[PDB]
């Protein structure tokens with residue numbers, strides 16, 4: 339179809355390897371939840387502009403959790419909350435401060451890639467897993483699909499907008 343394929347409505351699916359999923363967050367709270375139920379749990383939480391430090395509730399992987407959040411920018415903030423085993427408390431692994439409200443997740447090269455840092459200079463980073471194929475995602479906002487070969491385009495969107 340189009341190289342920027344979408345938008346698609348919120349759903350749950352197992353992303354194929356080699357394709358960036360670009361999610362256009364349009365509200366606060368949980369953007370997506372992704373797990374293989376074995377060694378990888380990531381949830382992305384959206385925090386609106388100028389939020390003083392506070393503990394908010396988020397339902398993730400079916401359970402209500404309290405996360406400490408803040409955002410001292412005009413830009414939107416996206417926190418990666420992770421755990422690698424079912425018994426561990428989630429920790430804030432990475433952040434993305436963004437004027438464009440776009441977050442990205444990719445299966446490639448054996449590991450999960452996401453964007454982090456601050457637009458317009460956000461960059462990618464990897465996360466290891468021993469069960470990449472098992473990782474599914476529940477996405478709560480509209481999203482697009484872009485091949486990994488076209489990451490330069492994905493990077494422009496993340497940093498500069500659609």
Ligand SMILES: CC(=O)N[C@@H]1[C@@H](O[C@@H]2O[C@H](CO)[C@H](O)[C@H](O)[C@H]2O)[C@H](O)[C@@H](CO)O[C@H]1O
Nearest residue numbers: 444446447451460461462463486487489493
């Ligand atoms: C060195 C390399 O090829 N790394 C790949 C990643 O792409 C790089 O991403 C940085 C930002 O993090 C720069 O844009 C650099 O030019 C890119 O080469 C890529 O994000 C991941 C996932 O597709 O694959 C790495 O191999």
